[PDB]
Structure formats: C-alpha cells, structure tokens
C-alpha cells in the first residue's frame, strides 16, 4: 500500500521533526524560546520581533 508506506519514517525525533516557519528549510534552526526558525530569516526579521542592538 502506497497510502500506508507513505509514512514509514516517523518524525517523533531527529532533525526532521521541525523546520523553519518562514523559509521552510531545515538548517540553522533556533530552538531557544521556541522560535523554530532559521538564522538568516532571524536576522532579516529580528528588528520586527523587538530584538535590538544594545550589546
């Protein structure tokens, strides 16, 4: 069955359980404070979050 063989690798764990919420790429993720979103889009939209240049 294709419909039962289509989900044979569970995504309970591993790097495949999450992806970027903007560019949808599975690299450079930020799991800290539940951002779940890649670093380059983090730099692009960091000013809109409220994140500031202070240090």
């Amino acid at each position: 069955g294709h419909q039962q063989l289509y989900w044979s690798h569970p995504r309970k764990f591993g790097q495949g359980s999450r992806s970027c919420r903007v560019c949808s790429n599975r690299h450079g993720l930020i799991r800290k404070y539940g951002l779940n979103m890649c670093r380059q889009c983090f730099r692009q939209y960091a000013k809109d979050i409220g994140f500031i240049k202070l240090d």
Binding site: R39, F42, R43, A46, G50, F51, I52, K53, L54, D55
Partner: protein
C-alpha cells in the same frame, strides 16, 4: 534573553558574531481592596504598552 548568532549567511569571511537582548522589568503591587476597584483599574488606563494580570490567593 541573550541570543548570539553569526554574521555571514554563507561560510566565508571573518568569524564575526552579533548580540540580541531586551530589558524586561517586572513590577507588582498588592492591594487590600475589593474586586470592584480591581475591575475599575482593569477597565481604566488601557494602553498597548503594558499588560495587566490579576490573581487572588
């Protein structure tokens, strides 16, 4: 909330970083008053800057 990320989107160049923080200040006042004054305080002075939460023990 300190988050340190890189600078280069690629992997070429000088190894430089960047720093992100906020200042988050917490204030509480305890009051020996009935709930009607609490609802009047909640209804009055509504601004998008600071949120109001009330609890009773």
């Amino acid at each position: 909330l300190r988050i340190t990320t890189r600078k280069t989107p690629c992997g070429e160049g000088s190894k430089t970083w960047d720093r992100f923080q906020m200042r988050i200040h917490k204030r509480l006042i305890d009051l020996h008053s009935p709930s009607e004054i609490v609802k009047q305080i909640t209804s009055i002075s509504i601004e998008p800057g600071v949120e109001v939460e009330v609890t009773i023990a």
